[PDB]
Amino acid sequence: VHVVSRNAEGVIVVDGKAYPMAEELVATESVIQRSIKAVAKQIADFYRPLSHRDTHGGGGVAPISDENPLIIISVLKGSYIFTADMVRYLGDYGLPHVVDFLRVAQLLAETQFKALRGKHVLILEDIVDSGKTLRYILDKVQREHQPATLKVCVLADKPGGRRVTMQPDFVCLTVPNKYVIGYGFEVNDRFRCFRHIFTLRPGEARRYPAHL
Amino acid sequence: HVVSRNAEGVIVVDGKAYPMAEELVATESVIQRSIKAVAKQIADFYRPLSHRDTHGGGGVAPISDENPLIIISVLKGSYIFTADMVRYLGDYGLPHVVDFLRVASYNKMQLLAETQFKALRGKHVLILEDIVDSGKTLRYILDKVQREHQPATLKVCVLADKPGGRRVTMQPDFVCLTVPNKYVIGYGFEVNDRFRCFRHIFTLRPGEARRYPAHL
Numbered sequence A: 001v002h003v004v005s006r007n008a009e010g011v012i013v014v015d016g017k018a019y020p021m022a023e024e025l026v027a028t029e030s031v032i033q034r035s036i037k038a039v040a041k042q043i044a045d046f047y048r049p050l051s052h053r054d055t056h057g058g059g060g061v062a063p064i065s066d067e068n069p070l071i072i073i074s075v076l077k078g079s080y081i082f083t084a085d086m087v088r089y090l091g092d093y094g095l096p097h098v099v100d101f102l103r104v105a106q107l108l109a110e111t112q113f114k115a116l117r118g119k120h121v122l123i124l125e126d127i128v129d130s131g132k133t134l135r136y137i138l139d140k141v142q143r144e145h146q147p148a149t150l151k152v153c154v155l156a157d158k159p160g161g162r163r164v165t166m167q168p169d170f171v172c173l174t175v176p177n178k179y180v181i182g183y184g185f186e187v188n189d190r191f192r193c194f195r196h197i198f199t200l201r202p203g204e205a206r207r208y209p210a211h212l
Numbered sequence B: 001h002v003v004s005r006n007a008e009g010v011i012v013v014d015g016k017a018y019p020m021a022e023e024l025v026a027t028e029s030v031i032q033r034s035i036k037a038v039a040k041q042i043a044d045f046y047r048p049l050s051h052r053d054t055h056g057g058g059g060v061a062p063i064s065d066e067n068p069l070i071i072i073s074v075l076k077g078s079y080i081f082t083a084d085m086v087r088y089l090g091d092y093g094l095p096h097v098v099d100f101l102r103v104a105s106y107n108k109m110q111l112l113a114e115t116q117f118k119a120l121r122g123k124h125v126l127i128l129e130d131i132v133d134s135g136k137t138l139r140y141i142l143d144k145v146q147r148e149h150q151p152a153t154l155k156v157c158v159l160a161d162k163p164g165g166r167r168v169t170m171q172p173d174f175v176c177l178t179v180p181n182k183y184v185i186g187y188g189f190e191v192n193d194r195f196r197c198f199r200h201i202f203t204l205r206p207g208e209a210r211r212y213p214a215h216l
């Protein structure tokens, strides 16, 4: 499954498509999807037994259900593709959940959910590298929403890039200590649509200097 | 896929019961086939075109990774459709970038979230939207993007067209699926954020629309 080779220009070819911007393949689509689905099962297994504030039936505590679902906050723009795939796997495993979005760059877009007090909240994020983005988001969500519990699921962990303490509760994949592209990962919004994750050729992070 | 009803008259797809569903509209395989077919049409239409060159600060240049097609996806309902469409657009080699805007009705329309792209003048812009029903949401978005960003061209691709719902003239350029004149759920379509994760699209039993009254 997946034919991985190099053409005469030394460029990586996966299933007949060339990736001239890539240094090495990190993970094929088949490996990525198997990893996400495996973590979806872990998430569903962990949350389905839990209970939290009942906002459907007038208190007090009730099981996670369609009436009181797990609250998922997805971080835009980086996590939208990962989130789309993950929620479908969570549905397959029967986890009741709802998704809202926050956008960070500075907070550019706020959540519209306003009843998260005493609720189980899960953040879906693309990658933990330095740890600074999640420290910022976790502090913000805890103080404004006062959730019962706050956990983080990342598609990717780059353990070698840490500047601050940040250990996600759920991790689908471990990536090399290199700039990654594909499956949501980008260079000025380019390359997010790839089905595979690759490392970027050095210096190519400046390929598109013009602001969109 | 196997689509049937159980002994309680409840629709079952691939062993999973959908008690909130009146009818199945489309299976995952039909939806994905339909999206990929539109991705080919979008790629074939835009691949040969050119627009403002912001990479070489020049005049005009072909759609490329240097000057990509600009896609504006309408949150929240379009995020799953968009995730799938962009991967199919990549399969067909269409250079593109995606930003997001969010809209809501109070009925009259209001912007909830603005796009962050600031150089769209003279660019080809494609709106990705979950559904065209009354047409009011897209008339509002198209009028706003046109006057504020001055794009070279402005087109719309919808996952679903509900033809009977029209109250203002609106025919998206690209349509993946046609749905019945009923409330649809699944594959991004929701009842108070429930049911978006379903891989299939269904019509909603009318009594289920106010099942989840509490604000999230």
Ligand SMILES: O=c1[nH]cnc2c(CNC[C@@H](O)CP(=O)(O)O)c[nH]c12
Pocket (backbone or CB within 6 Å): A078, A127, A128, A129, A130, A131, A132, A133, A134, A178, A179, A180, A181, A185, A186
């Ligand atoms: O490898 C990468 N490929 C593409 N984008 C990035 C980023 C930027 N976005 C995530 C960060 O903002 C998380 P943070 O570092 O704060 O934890 C870091 N690494 C990579």
Ligand SMILES: O=c1[nH]cnc2c(CNC[C@@H](O)CP(=O)(O)O)c[nH]c12
Pocket (backbone or CB within 6 Å): B077, B131, B132, B133, B134, B135, B136, B137, B138, B182, B183, B184, B185, B189, B190
């Ligand atoms: O069938 C449906 N299932 C779930 N949600 C909806 C909506 C709301 N969101 C889209 C509209 O806001 C577009 P508009 O009507 O203005 O074109 C309309 N139809 C359905």
